[PDB]
């Protein structure tokens, strides 16, 4: 079957510049079936390119397809604000197949995060489960690492993360890493730390608390 690998996983550029998106097929592929689509959050996709180089009606002049065989390239000459979204490529043999997707992202000043750690609320410690939340407020770039340490012991597989959409005001990100533990296993240690590693920090910041200490 046909498989379409889009590169890169996410492209990071500022307005006015030129984006060069890459769609890659697994075998030689016709240039008449390879459509490009644009999808903005919470909306259906928009057809941008069809065939391989043709603008759908109502698609302005900044958008342009190219390529053939196995490598095809959507290119946007001069980026505008409304062009930051996700872009998929189509190919169609016996049936349609899509690519995984490429994200556009606003490059900004390399900004350090704001690192906070919270202990479990006393209410939740009655229910029998402890959630230890670590907040990283407004950093850039999106790429960071949260490492939970419990009594000088690396924590693995018991945390979960989530991130917000690139903020429309200061074009930065925010992350929430939740460590979940049983009340019994919580009461078995003392030092809970969250050591963050980001490009805006000269050395890894570590916020921490000690259990049961006002």
């Amino acid at each position: 079957e046909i498989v379409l690998t889009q590169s890169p996983g996410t492209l990071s550029l500022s307005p006015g510049e030129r984006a060069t998106l890459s769609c890659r097929a697994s075998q030689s592929v016709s240039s008449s079936y390879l459509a490009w689509y644009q999808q903005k959050p919470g909306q259906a996709p928009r057809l941008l390119i069809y065939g391989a180089s043709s603008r759908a009606t109502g698609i302005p002049d900044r958008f342009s397809g190219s390529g053939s065989g196995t490598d095809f390239t959507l290119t946007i000459s001069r980026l505008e604000p409304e062009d930051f979204a996700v872009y998929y490529c189509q190919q169609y043999g016996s049936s349609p197949t899509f690519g995984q997707g490429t994200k556009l992202e606003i490059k900004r000043t390399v900004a350090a995060p704001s690192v906070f750690i919270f202990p479990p609320s006393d209410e939740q410690l009655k229910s029998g489960t402890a959630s230890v939340v670590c907040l990283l407020n407004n950093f850039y770039p999106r790429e960071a690492k949260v490492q939970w340490k419990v009594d000088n012991a690396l924590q693995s597989g018991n945390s979960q993360e989530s991130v917000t959409e690139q903020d429309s005001k200061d074009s930065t990100y925010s992350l929430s890493s939740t460590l979940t533990l049983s009340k019994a296993d919580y009461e078995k240690h003392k030092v809970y730390a969250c050591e963050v590693t980001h490009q805006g920090l000269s050395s890894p910041v570590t916020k921490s608390f000690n259990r049961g200490e006002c």
């Binding site: 996709p45 759908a56 349609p96 919270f118 609320s121 939340v133 989530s162």
Partner: protein
């Protein structure tokens, strides 16, 4: 020129549901029509094709569980889902394929969820603090989607961060909502998060201190 999807909802694992796609501006029976779903935070997955001449094609992940049908005078495309599983939880779109000219008409879609989950209630725990300070509210163990989190009944908005929900091992969602305020205003201003989960008839105002 529209494609309006209906039928989406919640289904237990192993149950069945039928989705609708109401059209105007194109006549469905003459067109290639496609069903394409999108799981939360994933990409586009082709699901079901149907020729103008009635020939059908299906992707291997749904072959044998899904049936694609239409209805000429009602101008409505359908998709019968049987023996549903957890993976099929997604937003489901119908589109008009022009093959060479791609798919030029899409619908905003209807959301499908699959889980032996129940309904419970979102427990709201405080995220209390002890240059700048941070406080928040942990909305934990509610299902299904979604919840609305405001602060000071809408007054405080500057610096608020409502996180997208994560789905825990129990089959239960959970998210956090935080706000950064000046460190001094801790003793003077009252901070209460406002949480509302309409499925479980649950609204909470928790004070963080």
């Amino acid at each position: 020129v529209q494609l309006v999807e209906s039928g989406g909802g919640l289904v237990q694992p192993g149950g069945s549901l039928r989705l609708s796609c109401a059209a105007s501006g194109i006549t469905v029976s003459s067109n290639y029509m496609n069903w394409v779903r999108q799981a939360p935070g994933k990409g586009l997955e082709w699901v079901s094709l149907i020729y103008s001449g009635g020939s059908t094609y299906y992707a291997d992940s749904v072959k044998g569980r899904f049936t694609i049908s239409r209805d000429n005078s009602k101008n409505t495309l359908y998709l019968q889902m049987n023996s549903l599983r957890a993976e099929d939880t997604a937003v489901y779109h119908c589109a008009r394929d022009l093959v060479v000219y791609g798919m030029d008409v899409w619908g905003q879609g209807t959301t499908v969820t699959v889980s032996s989950a129940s309904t419970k209630g979102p427990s709201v725990f405080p995220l209390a603090p002890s240059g700048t300070a941070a406080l928040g509210c942990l909305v934990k163990d509610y299902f299904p989607e979604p919840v609305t989190v405001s602060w000071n009944s809408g007054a405080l908005t500057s610096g608020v961060h409502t996180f997208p929900a994560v789905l825990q091992s129990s089959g239960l969602y959970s998210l956090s909502s935080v706000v950064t305020v000046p460190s001094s205003s801790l003793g003077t201003q009252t901070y209460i998060c406002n949480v509302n989960h309409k499925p479980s008839n649950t609204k909470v105002d928790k004070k963080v201190e």
